[PDB]
Amino acid sequence: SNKINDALNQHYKLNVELGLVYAHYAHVADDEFDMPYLGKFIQHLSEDKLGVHKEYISDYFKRNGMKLKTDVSVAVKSIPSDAKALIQEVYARENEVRDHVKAIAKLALAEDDYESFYFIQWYVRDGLKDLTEVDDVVKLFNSSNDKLIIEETIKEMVEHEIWG
Amino acid sequence: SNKINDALNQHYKLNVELGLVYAHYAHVADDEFDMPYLGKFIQHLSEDKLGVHKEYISDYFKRNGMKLKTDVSVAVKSIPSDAKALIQEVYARENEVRDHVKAIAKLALAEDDYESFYFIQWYVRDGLKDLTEVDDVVKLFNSSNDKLIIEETIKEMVEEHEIWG
Amino acid sequence: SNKINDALNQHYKLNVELGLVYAHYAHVADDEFDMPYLGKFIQHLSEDKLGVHKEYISDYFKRNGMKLKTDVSVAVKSIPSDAKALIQEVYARENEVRDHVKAIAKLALAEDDYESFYFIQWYVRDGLKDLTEVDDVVKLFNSSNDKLIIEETIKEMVEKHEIWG
Amino acid sequence: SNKINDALNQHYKLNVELGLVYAHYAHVADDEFDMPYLGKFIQHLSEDKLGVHKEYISDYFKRNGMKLKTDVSVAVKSIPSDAKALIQEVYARENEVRDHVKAIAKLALAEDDYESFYFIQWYVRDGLKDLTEVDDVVKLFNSSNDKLIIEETIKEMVEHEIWG
Amino acid sequence: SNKINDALNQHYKLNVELGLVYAHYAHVADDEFDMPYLGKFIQHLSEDKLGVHKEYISDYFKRNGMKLKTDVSVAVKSIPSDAKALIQEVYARENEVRDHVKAIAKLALAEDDYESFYFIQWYVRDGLKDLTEVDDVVKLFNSSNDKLIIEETIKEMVEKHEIWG
Amino acid sequence: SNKINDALNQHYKLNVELGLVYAHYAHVADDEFDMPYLGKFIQHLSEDKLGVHKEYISDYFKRNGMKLKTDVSVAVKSIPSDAKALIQEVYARENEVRDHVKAIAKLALAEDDYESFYFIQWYVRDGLKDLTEVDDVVKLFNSSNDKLIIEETIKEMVEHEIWG
Numbered sequence: 001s002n003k004i005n006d007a008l009n010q011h012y013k014l015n016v017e018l019g020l021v022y023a024h025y026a027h028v029a030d031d032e033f034d035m036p037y038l039g040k041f042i043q044h045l046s047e048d049k050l051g052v053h054k055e056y057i058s059d060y061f062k063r064n065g066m067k068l069k070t071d072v073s074v075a076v077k078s079i080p081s082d083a084k085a086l087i088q089e090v091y092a093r094e095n096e097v098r099d100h101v102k103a104i105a106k107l108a109l110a111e112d113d114y115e116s117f118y119f120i121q122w123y124v125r126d127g128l129k130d131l132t133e134v135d136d137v138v139k140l141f142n143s144s145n146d147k148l149i150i151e152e153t154i155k156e157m158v159e160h161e162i163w164g
Numbered sequence: 165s166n167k168i169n170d171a172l173n174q175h176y177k178l179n180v181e182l183g184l185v186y187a188h189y190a191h192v193a194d195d196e197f198d199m200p201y202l203g204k205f206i207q208h209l210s211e212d213k214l215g216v217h218k219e220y221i222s223d224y225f226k227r228n229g230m231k232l233k234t235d236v237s238v239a240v241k242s243i244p245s246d247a248k249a250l251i252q253e254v255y256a257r258e259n260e261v262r263d264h265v266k267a268i269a270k271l272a273l274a275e276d277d278y279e280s281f282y283f284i285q286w287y288v289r290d291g292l293k294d295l296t297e298v299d300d301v302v303k304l305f306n307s308s309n310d311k312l313i314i315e316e317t318i319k320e321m322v323e324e325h326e327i328w329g
Numbered sequence: 330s331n332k333i334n335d336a337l338n339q340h341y342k343l344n345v346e347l348g349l350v351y352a353h354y355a356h357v358a359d360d361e362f363d364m365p366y367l368g369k370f371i372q373h374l375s376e377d378k379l380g381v382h383k384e385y386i387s388d389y390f391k392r393n394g395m396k397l398k399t400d401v402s403v404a405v406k407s408i409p410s411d412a413k414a415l416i417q418e419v420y421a422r423e424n425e426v427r428d429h430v431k432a433i434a435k436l437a438l439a440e441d442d443y444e445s446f447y448f449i450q451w452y453v454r455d456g457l458k459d460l461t462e463v464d465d466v467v468k469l470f471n472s473s474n475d476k477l478i479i480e481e482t483i484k485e486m487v488e489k490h491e492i493w494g
Numbered sequence: 495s496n497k498i499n500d501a502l503n504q505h506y507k508l509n510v511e512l513g514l515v516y517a518h519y520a521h522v523a524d525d526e527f528d529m530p531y532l533g534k535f536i537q538h539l540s541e542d543k544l545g546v547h548k549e550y551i552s553d554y555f556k557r558n559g560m561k562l563k564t565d566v567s568v569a570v571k572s573i574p575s576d577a578k579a580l581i582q583e584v585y586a587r588e589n590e591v592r593d594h595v596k597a598i599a600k601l602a603l604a605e606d607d608y609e610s611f612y613f614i615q616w617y618v619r620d621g622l623k624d625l626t627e628v629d630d631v632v633k634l635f636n637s638s639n640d641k642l643i644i645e646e647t648i649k650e651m652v653e654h655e656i657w658g
Numbered sequence: 659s660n661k662i663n664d665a666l667n668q669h670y671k672l673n674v675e676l677g678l679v680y681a682h683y684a685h686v687a688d689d690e691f692d693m694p695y696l697g698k699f700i701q702h703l704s705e706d707k708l709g710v711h712k713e714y715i716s717d718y719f720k721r722n723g724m725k726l727k728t729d730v731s732v733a734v735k736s737i738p739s740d741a742k743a744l745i746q747e748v749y750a751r752e753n754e755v756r757d758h759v760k761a762i763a764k765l766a767l768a769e770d771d772y773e774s775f776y777f778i779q780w781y782v783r784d785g786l787k788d789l790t791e792v793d794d795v796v797k798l799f800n801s802s803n804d805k806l807i808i809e810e811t812i813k814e815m816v817e818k819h820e821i822w823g
Numbered sequence: 824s825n826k827i828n829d830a831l832n833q834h835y836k837l838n839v840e841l842g843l844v845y846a847h848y849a850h851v852a853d854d855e856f857d858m859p860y861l862g863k864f865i866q867h868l869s870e871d872k873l874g875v876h877k878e879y880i881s882d883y884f885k886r887n888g889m890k891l892k893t894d895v896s897v898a899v900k901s902i903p904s905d906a907k908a909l910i911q912e913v914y915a916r917e918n919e920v921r922d923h924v925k926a927i928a929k930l931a932l933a934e935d936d937y938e939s940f941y942f943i944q945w946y947v948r949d950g951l952k953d954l955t956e957v958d959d960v961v962k963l964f965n966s967s968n969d970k971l972i973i974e975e976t977i978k979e980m981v982e983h984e985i986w987g
């Protein structure tokens with residue numbers, strides 16, 4: 001169907017934009033806020049969003065017969081005042097890509113299509129995994145106030161049977 | 165220096181846009197014209213532009229003290245009708261990137277700023293290397309008109325010189 | 330979601346109660362019927378119930394932001410007479426667990442909450458797995474009338490699929 | 495739960511019949527059109543259809559409580575005229591198998607039998623996997639004409655994370 | 659030599675039909691008589707019949723120059739009432755396959771076609787081998803009474819000659 | 824004997840109830856107080872009581888021929904304010920388990936039941952080990968205020984000839 005194709009192309013575009021903006025965030029975090037390991041963490045998020053997250057969609061298109069568009073336009077206008085607000089912006093972006101995927105899954109079931117449902121299961125799982133990771137990183141900036149302790153913990157972080 | 169920073173920001177943006185365009189071309193050539201290994205080759209080029217070619221610039225800006233800006237935008241509305249035309253398209257893109265980086269190198273040598281000359285030497289080398297890598301594949305479509313033989317050749321190709329390595 | 334949280338609290342308490350009952354049944358079957366291996370089998374089932382089947386629910390709660398409630402109460406006041414009635418009672422308990430899981434799955438699907446659907450698929454599979462594991466032993470008693478042969482069979486069972494496993 | 499019982503019996507019968515027809519097709523493709531590796535390919539397809547595809551159904555029947563019925567009748571009288579039409583015929587057969595299994599899955603959801611849905615996910619995936627494996631072979635016959643080149647390619651032709 | 663051609667086509671048909679029938683019998687034996695290992699044994703017979711027993715005929719046809727024909731008509735509608743009757747049905751089918759292959763061999767030798775004789779010697783041996791393999795398990799249902807001993811013995815048979823090898 | 828049977832049934836019931844309560848406390852510590860490693864500590868604590876601590880009793884009952892009774896009543900409706908009060912509550916629980924075991928040992932020695940004395944020696948020895956392992960953690964919340972320091976210390980604590 002064409003509804004499914006539109007939804008998948010929108011998710012493609014969203015993933016590309018997220019990857020680019022995350023890369024910029026990682027750079028500004030490492031360089032301006034004196035936190036290299038936060039930079040590595042957000043860089044890994046950005047490389048994940050520009051890697052398999054869209055290669056899988058392109059592969060599915062080549063496989064079943066849909067066609068692919070390309071329209072991305074991003075520009076960074078502001079950068080949060082501290083590390084905490086930045087990590088919270090990241091948390092919000094992920095929290096919304098979750099609901100985007102939920103909408104796509106409902107649409108899939110309502111269209112008598114089941115290959116698309118079996119396919120979108122992967123994103124249903126990865127969304128929650130990534131959210132719990134970024135939240136476990138968010139929950140540090142309240143348990144402490146020293147910067148180097150948080151950085152050491154993130155260092156030892158950057159090195160399940162259902163949600164795994 | 166402001167001119168150096170502006171040229172390097174333009175180069176960063178250019179690499180990003182080329183990477184996106186190459187990935188889309190790879191999908192097209194693998195789905196529309198039935199040549200999977202050409203698709204894998206162009207996809208490798210795409211993973212190369214979106215990879216070290218911008219990480220190095222970001223790291224340099226971290227080191228020397230320059231500022232980064234990100235503003236990209238692309239749209240792929242017209243795509244060639246064959247495989248030969250597609251590979252010649254990407255050939256032209258590489259040939260233009262060569263001239264862009266030569267301009268940056270001249271600008272760096274004029275400003276009496278030698279760390280940037282040292283930095284840009286790597287791009288001076290990699291440009292010619294990638295240009296020959298893609299021209300070697302362009303030369304195939306003038307040898308045979310059989311698709312599967314060209315497929316076998318590019319296949320064995322996807323599977324280093326001292327100076328231009 | 331609130332009703333999903335109620336259903337999952339229900340299932341948590343159900344699993345805890347079943348685990349305690351199964352531990353008692355294993356002790357009884359070992360000490361009163363002189364069948365130590367039937368005891369080992371039921372005890373493995375009990376350690377399965379009090380183990381993974383509730384830590385998974387706890388982890389899901391800690392991951393999506395729901396609230397866990399704990400209120401259990403159990404008292405085994407009557408046991409069956411022989412081994413066959415015991416194993417048939419165990420069969421009935423498992424068979425009711427199946428129905429409870431189906432209820433939860435339907436409820437989750439009817440209100441557009443798909444993470445819980447993906448979560449509950451595991452329980453959907455494990456239900457039938459455990460049920461056939463139990464019925465394999467249930468069928469043994471109708472195939473003989475001696476006890477020690479059943480002992481040897483259960484032993485070679487406990488000393489041991491792409492879809493259901 | 496007899497509706498799903500009947501549907502699964504339909505699928506069992508269809509599987510064995512396709513297996514036999516493919517065995518005959520492989521013999522024909524080897525002996526008549528001088529292509530032994532196309533023979534190997536269709537032979538592996540038939541070994542797949544008569545292999546796990548029906549043992550899984552028998553096992554689900556043994557586990558849940560349904561009953562099995564064997565009822566087969568096959569006759570191969572008219573065969574395609576050349577290799578391309580043969581591989582295209584196989585393509586269409588598997589294309590129809592996909593529609594059949596999708597109908598089974600919709601019926602399974604419509605009856606609140608979630609074990610059946612969980613069971614049929616496997617076929618829903620393997621259908622598209624086999625379909626793309628056969629499409630990859632049928633697309634070779636338009637890329638050249640020398641039968642020996644195509645023989646070499648199919649020779650060198652004999653796993654993903656989602657469709658794996 | 660259309661005689662040997664029609665005989666081998668008949669044998670192909672019969673092999674496929676007994677393959678399917680053995681599959682169905684293995685199912686009904688595992689599910690209704692509560693004897694899993696007897697089901698494994700009959701399933702191994704089923705998988706043998708549809709296996710090399712017909713690929714050898716099709717391969718000889720390719721290598722020689724005869725024509726192949728497929729036609730199957732199977733319908734299972736009546737099932738024996740216990741395990742003994744089932745294994746005796748299997749016994750009768752094997753005993754008939756022996757007679758069929760003997761007829762084929764005599765026809766081949768009377769036709770002055772010695773390649774068919776050389777080919778059919780394999781089936782001449784394997785028929786007696788498989789008949790002995792089935793008779794060994796037939797003889798079990800007259801030596802004991804409880805199903806579990808028979809299960810253990812069939813299991814040890816299925817987990818494990820210079821002439822009839 | 825009879826009094827020994829009654830005391831041992833009491834102890835079995837107590838150990839089961841402690842297991843369940845400690846499980847709940849571990850969950851609430853990890854989720855609400857943002858301390859996952861304390862959660863794992865208390866989780867191993869719980870799984871200890873629902874492990875050997877009751878299987879040993881049931882085994883001894885099978886071995887000398889006493890009668891086992893199960894009856895459990897557990898409902899948690901009050902929870903401490905933060906981690907310190909939590910671990911202090913745990914400390915009180917273990918401290919009470921000690922003197923329950925002492926009462927059992929005295930009763931066993933009075934009635935000239937020496938097999939029960941030899942049995943309860945294990946429970947007598949493995950009360951001071953548990954109490955000192957809990958005290959090592961409860962006296963960490965006196966030295967520091969930066970929750971991540973205590974987190975790392977407990978982490979390294981997770982991963983004797985007489986008492987051991």
Ligand SMILES: [Fe+3]
Pocket residue numbers: 048053126127130
């Ligand atoms: Fe991800």
Ligand SMILES: [Fe+3]
Pocket residue numbers: 212213217290294
């Ligand atoms: Fe490069």
Ligand SMILES: [Fe+3]
Pocket residue numbers: 377455456458459
């Ligand atoms: Fe289980």
Ligand SMILES: [Fe+3]
Pocket residue numbers: 542543547620624
């Ligand atoms: Fe398949």
Ligand SMILES: [Fe+3]
Pocket residue numbers: 706784785788
């Ligand atoms: Fe044989």
Ligand SMILES: [Fe+3]
Pocket residue numbers: 871949953
């Ligand atoms: Fe202890």
